[PDB]
Each structure stands twice: as structure tokens, then as C-alpha cells.
Amino acid sequence: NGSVADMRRSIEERSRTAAATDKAVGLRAYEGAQQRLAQIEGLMDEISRTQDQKAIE
Amino acid sequence: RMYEAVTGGRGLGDLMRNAQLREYLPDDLRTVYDSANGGGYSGISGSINDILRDERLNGSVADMRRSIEERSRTAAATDKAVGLRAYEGAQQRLAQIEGLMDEISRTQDQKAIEELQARIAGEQAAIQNETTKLQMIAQLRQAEQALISEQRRERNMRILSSGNQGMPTIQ
Amino acid sequence: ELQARIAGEQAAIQNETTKLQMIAQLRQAEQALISEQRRERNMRILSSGNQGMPTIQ
Amino acid sequence: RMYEAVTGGRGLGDLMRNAQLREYLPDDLRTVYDSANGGGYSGISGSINDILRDERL
């Protein structure tokens, strides 16, 4: 809606924002993945100390 | 004693559960593309503003051209190199899995095989994490190509802008 | 033991999934490199630094 | 004997854990595309320079 110039500005803004949003989502997700790795390593550290059968199950 | 060893609660679970790792992905996808202006997603919001600031070209148009060509070539090479090194890591991962199955044959007691099962489960979790990381790398690759295209179009708009006022002078 | 064997088998299929992702990324990179080579050839033909032209004789 | 067979720690876990396979993927993705010049990701940086050298016609 609106004048064709407003349409142009809206479309260019959408394009730039879409590219930037893609990049930012990827970056933050990768940080989360690296923290997720740390958590898995911690769970394997817990495995070394398990004593009873109920604990390991 | 053995009944106590089998029954009861041991507290595992509620173990490393407060780490809110769901906050590193968007809560809802309706507003994921409205995050830059505010609202939507705030972890990306700041990042988006920084990225958009850094993607604006400066200097002469020739410098813009050289920067864009360098970005394109470097992006292709980076994609290839990341793929190659990741594949080497995947082969080493296969060797590790085979080793864990070698350990499966020598297991003797029940506790030993249960620990080995949980170790293999953790190994699967690690491979899951690598799968997620590869997905994230692919998304970043796509975003980088889009950004290079945006820079190209910014340069094109700057050359052909109707706000330009200059022309050659007859002297 | 059979459960742990099947778990290892799942880990192997996970590894193949990661390998396929890596192959797809490499495919994309190869296509990008071919495009880059095409554009290098195009730039070399149309370069403004060229100084030659046919001679009248 | 059977109680000893069920309970205790067996050392599995801390088994093949020093293999740093996370080093074959980028640590952070902000600097993944600055790796060629130096910094970013050192492991791909040697590979990127070789690839860019080999892709010149």
C-alpha cells in the first residue's frame, strides 16, 4: 500500500533485514550449540562417578 | 543392601537442567523478522543492528568493487575448507564409534555394560550436536551470500542514483 | 550388549547423516567456485587494462 | 559377589574422551569468514589460502 516509492523503501528494508536476521539467528544458535556440547561433556563426566544401578539407569 | 542399590531415587535428572539453552533459538517465528526494530527476538536484535551497520559500504566505488569480489572468492573458499575439515572430523568420529563397539565385546559385569550404553548415548548426543552445528553453518553460508548480493546492489544503486549531480565539464 | 550394539549402529547412521550434510555443503561450494572462475574469465576478456587491437596492414 | 557385580564404578566414560573432535568445526561463527586473512579459524585458514591459489585460471 502507499506510493511506489514507499513500496521500494519497504522492499529494500525487508531484503536487508532478512539477510541480517538470517546471519544473527545462525550466530546465536551456534553459541547455543557450543554450550550444548559443554553440557553433554558434563553429563559424561557424571557417568564416571555412577555407583549403583539405579543411578546409571 | 542390594535392594537399596536397585530401588530409590538418586537425583540424576534435575542435573544440568537450569541451563536455558532454548533461549538461543527464537521463541516464536511470527516476529523473527521484526526483531531489528525492537521486539520479536532480542538476542538477534542487537546482533542485527550491528550487522546492518557493518554491511554498509564506504569509500570509492572501486574499493567497493574490490571488497565485494574479495568477499565472494573468500566465501566460496571458506565453504569448501569448512566442508573438508569437517569431513576429516567425521571420519575420526567413525573410528571412535568403532572403538566403542570394540569395548562392547569385552564388557563383563552389568554395571560395565550399562556405563558403556550411557557412554554411547553421550556419543550419539555429540553427533547430534555436530548435525545442528552443520545446519547452522549452512544457514550462515546462505546469509553470507545474501549479504554479498545486498552489497552488490548497494554499489549498483550508488552508481545509478538519481541524486547524483555531476557531469563532465567542457574546457 | 545388543542394546549397546544397536546404539552404536545409530551412532554410525548419525555419522553418515553428518557426512551427507558435509557433501551437500561441498557441492554448493564447488558450484560457487565454478561461477567464480566463469566471472574471472569474463573479467579477463573485458578488462579495461587491455591495450591491443587489430592492425591495418 | 553379585552385589559387587552390580554396584561400583567401572571407568567406562572417560573412555576415548581426549579426542578433541570439536576442533574440526569452527569455534565461533562471527569470524569464520575472516579466517583467510588470519585469525578466525586457523585450521581452515591454511586450506583457504591453498584453495584460492588453486582456483586462479
Residue numbers in the entry:
A (entry chain C): 116 to 172
B (entry chain D): 59 to 229
C (entry chain E): 173 to 229
D (entry chain E): 59 to 115
Text taken from the publication that reported this structure:
Conjugative type IV secretion systems (T4SS) mediate bacterial conjugation, a process that enables the unidirectional exchange of genetic materials between a donor and a recipient bacterial cell. Bacterial conjugation is the primary means by which antibiotic resistance genes spread among bacterial populations. In this article, based on additional data, we present a more complete T4SS cryo-EM structure than that published earlier.
Indeed, TrwI/VirB6 features two key sites: a VirB2-binding site at its base in the IM, and a pilus-assembly site at its top. TrwJ/VirB5 is located at the tip of the stalk, and is expected to be recruited at the pilus tip during the early step of pilus biogenesis. In these regions of the T4SS structure, improved resolution resulted in better-defined densities at the tip of TrwJ/VirB5. In the TrwJ/VirB5 N-terminal tip, 11 residues could be added at the N-terminus (residues Gln23-Ala33). Middle panel, this newly built region is hydrophobic in nature. Viewed from the top, the hydrophobic tip of TrwJ/VirB5 resembles a needle (insets of each panel).
